[PDB]
């Protein structure tokens, strides 16, 4: 997943 808010990607 990527966070759709911060763009943080696992």
């Amino acid at each position, epitope marked *: *997943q990527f966070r*759709h808010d911060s*763009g943080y990607e696992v």
Partner: antibody
Amino acid sequence: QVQLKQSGPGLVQPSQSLSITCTVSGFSLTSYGIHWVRQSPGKGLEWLGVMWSGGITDFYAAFISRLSISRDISKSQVFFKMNSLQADDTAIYYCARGSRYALDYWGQGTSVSVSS
Amino acid sequence: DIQMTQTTSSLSASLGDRVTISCRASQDISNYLNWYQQKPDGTVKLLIYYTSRLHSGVPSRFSGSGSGTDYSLTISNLEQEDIATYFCQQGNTLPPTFGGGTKLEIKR
């Protein structure tokens, strides 16, 4: 109540730019991403880029030299600009809020026609 | 990019019918799959996120299922207000990508 309100033109001349402002309310730009998506007739939704919550942008590969996205946190505004529109850029353009998992609240859309 | 495919562009159904819309990803997306509804007036809403979670305010007649590469959105009993176009979107790997859409129409 979460709202995204778009402003910008219905008509762009070919080889001119498109500018759209997304004015948000009921949340802080510092907590959510603002994504830019378009829908062309006979095409689906296409993701163009985003202003992430932290203030950095990401652009889709096909738009890397044509897009500008910036924001004014105090005014709750995100600014979209796309350079040199052509016929295949006629579309409905949206801003949309990004939360943890998805684009959870959308702007009303800006119908952009490219024509001389 | 992860390519998203909605193999059916159009589906016909009667009010009250169970309606299922399919979506496939080109690789495993680990259940990070969202569904959007675009109404004829161009307004878009999130329906379902993370395969099966209902977005706030969305009727529980919408549900979602799947895993790996294959996902679906089901409307349990179809209503007039559901006549719209539905898009899936993978939330697994940047950049975000969408399916081609599935438009509903009324069968008569």
